[PDB]
A and B are shown apart, each in its own frame.
With several copies, the nearest count.
Chain A
């Protein structure tokens, strides 16, 4: 006798009209995920008969002309490939051709997105078995890539995108997996993918279109992962050339951004700031393949610089096929150049050296636009730390100096402060324990700001805030990974009060495990009573009770 789930599936597939099937898709998916075992059996028992009729119904739903039926078949194929295994993968070939045909046919775009996800899952699952790669993936894949590139190609000369940018995000997400898996098959399409993904790498205000963040992230991911398709093992060279071109593009945009301010910065690597015309607004970019789309205006230039910095972040986010040379010195010099330019404090506008030919409005726009560039620089430093781990220790002093200068210049923005807290946690986790006294002294205002934000959120000096959560995460690190001997007693008392009033178990525990010894050589009292009173039965106090 068959399991109840399979015969329920057969009866509901036979009885239901095709147009109401998408509404019954959740229960059908639940039932077919339940009966994975009958489909896993290699192909008379009633179970095998019902499995054969079920697969016949799936094929008839897929091949038949009904958008509701095609949608239902897409969902059923996804669930069946999820639960069946090798036996379903053996017969998935007419299903693969059917899903590509669904993408070719004019259907609702959610059905196309689900077909894209199902085909991506099919290729990832077919990667295990080489014979099925030869039979299925290699012939069907160029047609799928052509069908996707047909959708996301911009006919911008005649008309704008009939495909929404979320669907472009979906296609870029699928191709990001497939360039990693099948490099040689996806190699002919790289020139088309680059031209399709050119506008979404660093959008500006002059582009006059709103680009979703996920579209930019997946566009950058796909252009970085396109180095896998480089012929004759040229992946690393293409990666190095691309990242160095991005660094040079950052520098050239930074020239036109910092036209208003005389720059004392001189390059370690050997970059030279070209003369910039004082007449007119800053401008740049171009229609060339190597150049990003043109921009005009100081805010658009700041947006382009921020997008280029996010592209450099996405370089460290994505993996590489072969070992690559990472120009840490060039990135360090670039970030030093961008962080050296700081906006004046109130009443200190005349202190900063500026070109007299620049108008006051451009100066005001530059002072407004600087913290976003600084925030992108700090996020780039965070990604560099996350990828390098212990190899980012030699950059710690320069990243500390940049972070202190940025957080001092833009102290009144909560977002810059939050990014500074997130960066400072990783900095102290790497190289905070062995810092000299002067580094601790310049780090002191950041500790004061973080404690003030935590106490403001707790209301002891209110609702939770992302800057408050970042500072609360930073708070145990000030005890664990900072030299207590370099801290003044006022800072330690502020840290202890912040830990107590914040009810932070980790910070209170870290203050208990790292006592502070002052000049008189006698330890201050521990905050253990507060920790045991607030968290009596927690696991950390249980470890203390060992």
Chain B
């Protein structure tokens, strides 16, 4: 009853010669539903894992071993900008109109797309920030020093501060580099949770505002990329052993809830949802569709493979991009309403200026009148017509 689309990104040299694929393309746009096709491509891009962000108007891409961000316009269909940042980028995401960027130096910056501010935190992490997740209220950064720092967006973003920023909390139960970070859509203090994975083959569900660790899970291989289902009921985890694992948090024995065990106890997940033949390789990117029935994985040998979660059948290969696939981002089929539109980005400048916001204002029917009720009604409303006849005579 819908059409569904997703955006792919590749990295590295082309793997096989004479496959007739374009060598210059680095970002693809596909239509997953109803039938597989390619809408458009973007040229000259090499994006590592977790360095791609997709909005309705722009695609932001972090470049491998390079501090620049390539910004492409989805509206015009070309490359918009070559943004230069102070330090090399390990990961970047997009929350609202803010690009949140972690670096090799361990710093965190927030670049506001519309205002051009570059809010740079002191290097709280000792080594490189590997994964970043965000909410409307908090920003969570996991680094190579096994510390997941939880920061407040309000303290980082606000204007008149000249003092250094500090994280609200540090979640340090992990003992190795944080590979992935996923966050529940709830922002309430009691009901929220964030799910993190590390190189020590451990995956912890936290309550990040309280700082507590709700649940601990152990996998046979260390988790590469993670995604929760749209209902926030299950976790899909890719691993180094070329397998995909599913964890039901509200299944037979709930991981979280009234029927759960003690939070100090450890749950080990050993049954693979699926496995991948090693000529395809372990999945490097993992994404879940809008309905959640069907899933997409990207592999370093070029194959994009579709998994049926409900049907539990064998995965089928969509296409071979002849390059290591690093990012798959689903785009929502329904379009949301936002009062502004970001047609163009504003590059970060350290020059002192008044605070300015740059966007296109969208028609949102904020101004309402009785004349609009006259206009939009089929015919004329009865009371307004009666007043018109009284005014006529």
Binding site for B on A (CB under 8 A): 22-23, 25-26, 29-30, 33, 67-68, 71, 75, 78-79, 82-83, 108-111, 113-114, 117, 120-121, 124, 164-166, 169-170, 173, 210-214, 217-218, 221, 269, 314, 316-330, 332, 386-391, 393-398, 414, 431, 433-435, 460, 463, 480, 483-484, 497, 500-501, 503, 513-515, 525, 528-530, 532-534, 536-537, 541-542, 545-546
A-B contact pairs, 18 of them (CB 8 A): A33-B379, A111-B392, A113-B388, A212-B386, A317-B366, A318-B361, A328-B115, A328-B356, A386-B339, A389-B338, A389-B340, A396-B154, A431-B154, A434-B153, A460-B1, A529-B290, A530-B230, A546-B191
A residues near B342, Cβ cutoff 8 Å: 323
Partner of B153, one of A387, A393, A515: A393
A residues near B376, Cβ cutoff 8 Å: 463
Assuming the contacts A214-B369, A317-B366, asked whether A388 and B379 have C-beta atoms less than 8 A apart, the reply is no
Partner of B367, one of A221, A532, A542: A221
A435 nearest in chain B by CB position: B154
Assuming the contacts A323-B343, A386-B366, asked whether A22 and B380 have C-beta atoms less than 8 A apart, the reply is no
Asked if B190 is at the interface (CB within 8 A of a chain A CB), the reply is yes
Q: Is the pair A536, B185 in contact by a Cβ cutoff of 8 Å?
A: yes
Partner of B188, one of A386, A390, A542: A542
Q: Is the pair A109, B378 in contact by a Cβ cutoff of 8 Å?
A: no
Q: Chain B 92-129, CB within 8 Å of chain A: the 1/0 string?
A: 00011100000000000000101100000000000000
Binding site for A on B (CB under 8 A): 1, 95-97, 112, 114-115, 136-138, 152-155, 157-160, 168, 185-191, 229-232, 290-292, 310, 332, 334, 338-344, 354-364, 366-367, 369, 371-372, 374-376, 378-380, 382-383, 385-393
Q: Is the pair B153, A391 in contact by a Cβ cutoff of 8 Å?
A: no
B residues near A537, Cβ cutoff 8 Å: 136, 185-187
Assuming the contacts A78-B379, A114-B380, asked whether A391 and B357 have C-beta atoms less than 8 A apart, the reply is yes
Q: Is the pair B390, A324 in contact by a Cβ cutoff of 8 Å?
A: no
B residues near A328, Cβ cutoff 8 Å: 115, 355-357
> What 6 A-B pairs have minimum CB-CB distances, sorted nearest first?
A536-B185, A329-B355, A529-B230, A110-B391, A329-B354, A320-B361
B residues near A121, Cβ cutoff 8 Å: 375
Assuming the contacts A108-B391, A398-B159, asked whether A326 and B188 have C-beta atoms less than 8 A apart, the reply is no
Q: Is the pair B382, A433 in contact by a Cβ cutoff of 8 Å?
A: no
B residues near A173, Cβ cutoff 8 Å: 369, 371-372
A residues near B387, Cβ cutoff 8 Å: 110, 212
B residues near A327, Cβ cutoff 8 Å: 354-356
B residues near A71, Cβ cutoff 8 Å: 392
Q: Is the pair A501, B1 in contact by a Cβ cutoff of 8 Å?
A: yes
Partner of B159, one of A110, A395, A435, A515: A395
- Shortest CB-to-CB span from B49 to chain A, Å, is 24
Q: Is the pair B385, A29 in contact by a Cβ cutoff of 8 Å?
A: yes
A433 nearest in chain B by CB position: B137
Q: Is the pair A532, B358 in contact by a Cβ cutoff of 8 Å?
A: no
Partner of B359, one of A78, A83, A323: A323
A residues near B190, Cβ cutoff 8 Å: 513-515
Q: Is the pair B375, A120 in contact by a Cβ cutoff of 8 Å?
A: yes
B residues near A463, Cβ cutoff 8 Å: 376
A residues near B186, Cβ cutoff 8 Å: 536-537, 541-542, 545
- Shortest CB-to-CB span from B167 to chain A, Å, is 12
Q: Is the pair B391, A326 in contact by a Cβ cutoff of 8 Å?
A: no
A75 to B343, CA, bound (A): 42
Assuming the contacts A110-B391, A393-B154, asked whether A212 and B357 have C-beta atoms less than 8 A apart, the reply is no
Partner of A324, one of B185, B232, B360, B391: B360
A215 nearest in chain B by CB position: B386
B residues near A26, Cβ cutoff 8 Å: 382, 385-386
Q: Is the pair B292, A117 in contact by a Cβ cutoff of 8 Å?
A: no
Of the candidates B229, B291, B338, B386, the one having the most CB atoms from chain A within 10 angstroms of its own CB is B386
Q: Is the pair B232, A213 in contact by a Cβ cutoff of 8 Å?
A: no
- Shortest CB-to-CB span from B70 to chain A, Å, is 21
- Shortest CB-to-CB span from B207 to chain A, Å, is 12
A residues near B114, Cβ cutoff 8 Å: 391
Q: Is the pair A217, B367 in contact by a Cβ cutoff of 8 Å?
A: yes
B residues near A269, Cβ cutoff 8 Å: 354
Q: Is the pair A484, B157 in contact by a Cβ cutoff of 8 Å?
A: no
A525 to B293, CA, bound (A): 10
Q: Is the pair A29, B393 in contact by a Cβ cutoff of 8 Å?
A: no
Partner of B189, one of A317, A318, A387, A484: A484
A538 to B357, CA, bound (A): 28
Partner of B137, one of A164, A166, A431, A460: A431
A residues near B360, Cβ cutoff 8 Å: 319-324
A327 to B358, CA, bound (A): 9
**New contact pairs (18) apart from A213-B386, A529-B290, CB-CB < 8 Å:** A110-B388, A117-B375, A173-B369, A212-B386, A319-B360, A323-B358, A387-B339, A387-B361, A398-B160, A483-B189, A514-B190, A515-B190, A529-B292, A530-B230, A530-B291, A533-B290, A542-B186, A545-B186
Q: Is the pair B390, A323 in contact by a Cβ cutoff of 8 Å?
A: no
B residues near A83, Cβ cutoff 8 Å: 378
Q: Is the pair B357, A210 in contact by a Cβ cutoff of 8 Å?
A: no
A312 to B64, CA, bound (A): 45
Q: Is the pair A319, B383 in contact by a Cβ cutoff of 8 Å?
A: no
A residues near B191, Cβ cutoff 8 Å: 513, 542, 545-546
B residues near A542, Cβ cutoff 8 Å: 186, 188, 191
- Shortest CB-to-CB span from A113 to chain B, Å, is 8
Q: Is the pair B157, A394 in contact by a Cβ cutoff of 8 Å?
A: yes
Q: Is the pair A391, B96 in contact by a Cβ cutoff of 8 Å?
A: yes
Partner of A393, one of B157, B374, B375: B157
Of the candidates B96, B292, B357, the one having the most CB atoms from chain A within 10 angstroms of its own CB is B357
A320 to B292, CA, bound (A): 37
A256 to B362, CA, bound (A): 36
B152 nearest in chain A by CB position: A434
A395 to B159, CA, bound (A): 7
B186 nearest in chain A by CB position: A545
B residues near A484, Cβ cutoff 8 Å: 189
Partner of A391, one of B97, B367, B386: B97
B residues near A114, Cβ cutoff 8 Å: 380, 388
